[PDB]
Design a protein around this ligand. Structure first.
Ligand code: FES
Length: 108
């Protein structure tokens, strides 16, 4: 089941947004009109990747110790993080952004 998480204008290109469902915090990223959803917690220290997190193209930088992840694959781009992010399916219908919060997946 895909759940409406936010509306598209809440996440403009180059921005991120934290959403929540059940226990789970999820970061929504808009990269040039394409939407991506990952776990919100940085895998180094669990800081929110949607709190002061710079987005440079499709690479998000954690504000705390400058760890970086590709928001497409969840793959690490710069330490201190070691583990990739969980990634969630995400779909746009009209102005609605829908995320399947039940379907977290993880590389490697
Ligand atoms: S908590 Fe994200 S890089 Fe340290």
């Amino acid at each position: 089941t895909f759940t409406k998480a936010c509306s598209v204008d809440e996440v403009p290109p180059g921005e991120a947004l934290q959403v929540s469902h059940d226990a789970q915090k999820v970061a929504i990223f808009n990269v040039d009109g394409e939407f991506f959803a990952t776990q919100d917690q940085c895998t180094h220290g669990e800081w929110s990747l949607s709190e002061g997190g710079y987005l440079d193209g499709d690479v998000v930088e954690c504000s705390l110790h400058m760890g970086k992840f590709c928001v497409r694959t969840g793959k690490v781009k710069s330490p201190p993080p070691c583990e990739p992010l969980k990634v969630y399916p995400i779909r746009i219908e009209g102005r609605d952004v829908l995320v399947d919060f039940s379907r977290a997946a993880l590389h490697a």
